[PDB]
Design a protein around this ligand. Structure first.
Ligand SMILES: Nc1ncnc2c1[nH]c(=O)n2[C@@H]1O[C@H](COP(=O)(O)O)[C@@H](O)[C@H]1O
Lengths: 207, 207
């Protein structure tokens, strides 16, 4: 199946087409039917392998546009690094032209990102330490998150973000959809699946 | 996604709708994009009903009608039990109305099944012992198999059919597509995968 073969809004298919994005990777191909219907998934694939559309398209498809000033984000993507936050945000912004996407990461000041959150966001793509700095401040409100994504969860674990990731997920409604990407499914990932996911389907494309 | 949302032939969708089946189960939904594109998959789902369309629809879609007298099957579905051979043959028959499906199983004589095979077959659904016996007789020819399915591999193991299943797989062309369904993924299944499958994606829906 090409992306054209999935039940995607015409505007999303045209945004894909324009970027030369035609063909889901195998993890995407298997994940999309479930993810598009709101189901929780664990995607296990070789690190850095392409899987972004497995969560970006479900976010694009699930979230209608909003103009409401100071609205809280309806999608949260946690990723380990600024570099991945910037790359994912860019990919998501391109496939969800209707959504306000804000990247959040430390190693710079608070003002700029604080002002974006306070203005409005539909999707936040965040490194966990900086994201948590915001929740306890009262600036990041996670009470409307509909879709949470854990990107490169093994790296988040190796970096020592376990407690931050958990606290951030705990600040979201358990009624959300959760998508977990882990190369190796270590004990922490399995704890996440048990504590923070609902009957998640495992898709493993490490051949 | 409903079955109508996949790229299936209209006559196959009509066959499904005529059986009252509109919606894939999660295993079916996640499997179909890859299976319809000819890729190998391991589907980990509970024993019993709920998985047939993950292999029956790819078989229906992949195989064009043929009228050749005495033709050899292009799909082989192995089941652990005689009851399931009959059940799966019936299910496949219904969704592939353009194909001749022949059930092969013990617990009865050899004549009717042998006559059916000699007349010709597009798909054979078999228990492993009877299938290997007909292979040895030169009645069942597996040289044209394009799709091989192992439905309920765990029971095949517990019943002691490992040798027979491996011999049958070995008798088919390695160019084929292979779909393996297992509730537990025991070692034997993993070694079958390693030997007989091509970079399979694993999809585990067990709750
Ligand atoms: N279906 C798809 N087609 C093309 N590029 C994709 C894709 N899904 C996906 O995530 N990408 C990109 O592929 C990148 C990874 O590619 P890699 O490093 O494995 O060559 C990801 O970071 C994305 O930028």
């Amino acid at each position: 199946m090409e992306f054209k073969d999935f039940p995607l809004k015409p505007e999303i298919l045209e945004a894909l087409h324009g970027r030369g994005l035609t063909t889901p990777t195998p993890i995407e191909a298997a994940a999309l039917p479930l993810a598009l219907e709101g189901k929780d998934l664990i995607g296990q694939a070789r690190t850095g392998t392409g899987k972004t559309l497995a969560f970006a398209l479900p976010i694009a498809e699930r979230l209608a546009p909003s103009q409401e000033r100071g609205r809280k984000p309806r999608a949260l993507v946690l990723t380990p690094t600024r570099e991945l936050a910037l790359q994912v945000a860019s990919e998501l912004t391109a496939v969800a032209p209707h959504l306000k996407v804000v990247a959040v990461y430390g190693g710079t000041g608070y003002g700029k990102q604080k002002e974006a959150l306070l203005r409005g966001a539909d999707a936040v793509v965040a490194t966990p330490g900086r994201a948590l700095d915001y929740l306890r401040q009262g600036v990041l409100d996670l009470s409307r998150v509909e879709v949470a994504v854990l990107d490169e969860a093994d790296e988040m674990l190796s970096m020592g973000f376990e407690e931050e990731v958990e606290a951030l997920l705990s600040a979201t409604p358990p009624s959300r959809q959760t998508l977990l990407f882990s190369a190796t499914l270590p004990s922490w990932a399995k704890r996440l699946a048990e504590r923070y996911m609902k009957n998640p389907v495992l898709i493993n494309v490490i051949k």
